[PDB]
Structure formats: structure tokens, C-alpha cells
Amino acid sequence: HHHHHHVAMSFSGKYQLQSQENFEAFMKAIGLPEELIQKGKDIKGVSEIVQNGKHFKFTITAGSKVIQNEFTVGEECELETMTGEKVKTVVQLEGDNKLVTTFKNIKSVTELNGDIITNTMTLGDIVFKRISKRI
């Protein structure tokens, strides 16, 4: 009560993998080995995001290691993939609890819905999806 001065929703929180679709098709296409794919779809990972005003931290716990990144929105930084490949880009927000970023041919769209994180990525013709839930 008595809060949110024309600003609401918050990417700050920790989350937990519920489900994912096109995972194997995407992981094979980005050149990961079948070992990391079979453990990556079986073992449900954890995920964490920290909003820091203009700054944003991304943390994704796979079934063996965590990938940590940081950027500032509208500033030109880099993001690490699960394969360990390093790629420069800029991230934007459409004012509607949804971040958007592209790379070369990969169109990534994160979406916060309360205590749920929807995430939809589109590399070429492959459409990777991922759902996590805020613990």
C-alpha cells in the first residue's frame, strides 16, 4: 500500500526452471555436445536476475555451472552463451515488463508476468521457449 510512483514491476528476484520447448533443436544448432543437452533438459536449472536501476545483471544456473553477465540498458555491452561464446550487443525495454535484444540472427525476448518468467528466443527458423517460476 502507498507505493509505485507511476512505476511498477521488478526484474529483481530468483527463479526456477519449470519447462522448455525446442531446447535440443536450439542446443544442437548452437553447436553444444549431446552430453550437455541430455543433462541440460533432464536436470531443471535455476535462474536469477538483478535489476540495478539502469544496470541489469543476468545469472543462469545450468546443470554443472552458472553463467553470469551484466550490462546497462541502452549502453553497448556483451552477453555470454551456455557454450561460452562471447557476443556484443545492446538491450532495450518496451515499457511493458518485457526486454528485447538481438545479436546477428537470434531475436531474444524476455517477459516478466508476476511470479513467472516467460522467455522466447528465435534463431533463424528455430523458436526456443523457456518458462521459470519465482521462488
Side-chain angles (χ1 to χ4, degrees):
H1 253 57
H2 199 289
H3 248 52
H4 302 342
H5 304 176
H6 297 178
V7 287
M9 298 284 263
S10 62
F11 291 90
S12 63
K14 206 220 302 295
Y15 316 94
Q16 171 183 220
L17 184 60
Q18 299 301 292
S19 270
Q20 56 188 358
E21 300 168 44
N22 255 320
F23 178 83
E24 303 192 336
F26 178 83
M27 297 259 119
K28 272 97 175 287
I30 66 154
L32 286 165
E34 183 172 37
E35 177 177 55
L36 290 175
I37 298 162
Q38 293 313 292
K39 67 93 106 300
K41 60 128 290 182
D42 190 276
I43 309 302
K44 259 63 72 181
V46 186
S47 199
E48 181 179 308
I49 301 169
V50 189
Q51 193 74 61
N52 299 302
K54 240 306 199 81
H55 262 289
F56 181 102
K57 244 182 185 76
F58 226 151
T59 6
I60 306 88
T61 302
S64 64
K65 63 154 290 193
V66 186
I67 302 79
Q68 308 108 62
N69 291 299
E70 180 171 62
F71 63 84
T72 304
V73 175
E75 311 301 318
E76 191 166 274
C77 297
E78 73 288 82
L79 296 171
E80 187 173 295
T81 312
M82 296 191 182
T83 185
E85 182 178 299
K86 303 259 57 167
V87 284
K88 257 138 170 174
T89 190
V90 181
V91 181
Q92 280 294 297
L93 209 164
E94 64 182 284
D96 194 39
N97 41 264
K98 289 152 73 197
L99 291 160
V100 176
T101 186
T102 56
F103 295 89
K104 296 91 184 294
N105 51 268
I106 301 147
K107 183 190 301 82
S108 293
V109 178
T110 305
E111 171 184 319
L112 199 170
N113 275 207
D115 52 307
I116 310 298
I117 299 286
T118 295
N119 193 285
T120 300
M121 298 176 55
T122 302
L123 188 163
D125 201 42
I126 306 167
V127 184
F128 175 64
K129 286 160 174 170
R130 179 162 174 256
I131 304 93
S132 292
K133 182 265 182 295
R134 201 280 294 161
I135 333 101

